[PDB]
Amino acid sequence: IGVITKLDLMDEGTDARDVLENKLLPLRRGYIGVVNRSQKDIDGKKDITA
Amino acid sequence: FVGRDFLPRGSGIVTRRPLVLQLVNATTEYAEFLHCKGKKFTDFEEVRLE
Numbered sequence: 498i499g500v501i502t503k504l505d506l507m508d509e510g511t512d513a514r515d516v517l518e519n520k521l522l523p524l525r526r527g528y529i530g531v532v533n534r535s536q537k538d539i540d541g542k543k544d545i546t547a
Numbered sequence: 548f549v550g551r552d553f554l555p556r557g558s559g560i561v562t563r564r565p566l567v568l569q570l571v572n573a574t575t576e577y578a579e580f581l582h583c584k585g586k587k588f589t590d591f592e593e594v595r596l597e
Contacts (some may be wrong), residue, residue, distance in 0.1 A: 511558040521559070 501525060502533045553591035
């Protein structure tokens with residue numbers, strides 16, 4: 498399972514649409530995009546619901 | 548570092564190959580190529596595009 502994380506930290510002018518839609522890199526099951534927690538969120542202790 | 552914008556970059560792989568820059572001290576500031584012998588460029592944008 499290939500996962501591309503922290504999708505809120507991308508370069509200005511860019512998008513991961515063709516990467517996550519299994520178009521830039523051909524994969525059998527494609528990718529699943531999540532956003533993990535940065536160091537600020539690590540310090541803030543973000544829970545499951547939020 | 549040069550001071551003028553004439554070298555590409557971008558999303559995905561764009562900055563791929565450096566330039567063969569042979570700087571020669573002369574009076575007139577211009578540019579010439581191996582594959583464009585007979586033609587002289589004065590703009591680095593023209594250099595970048597070709």
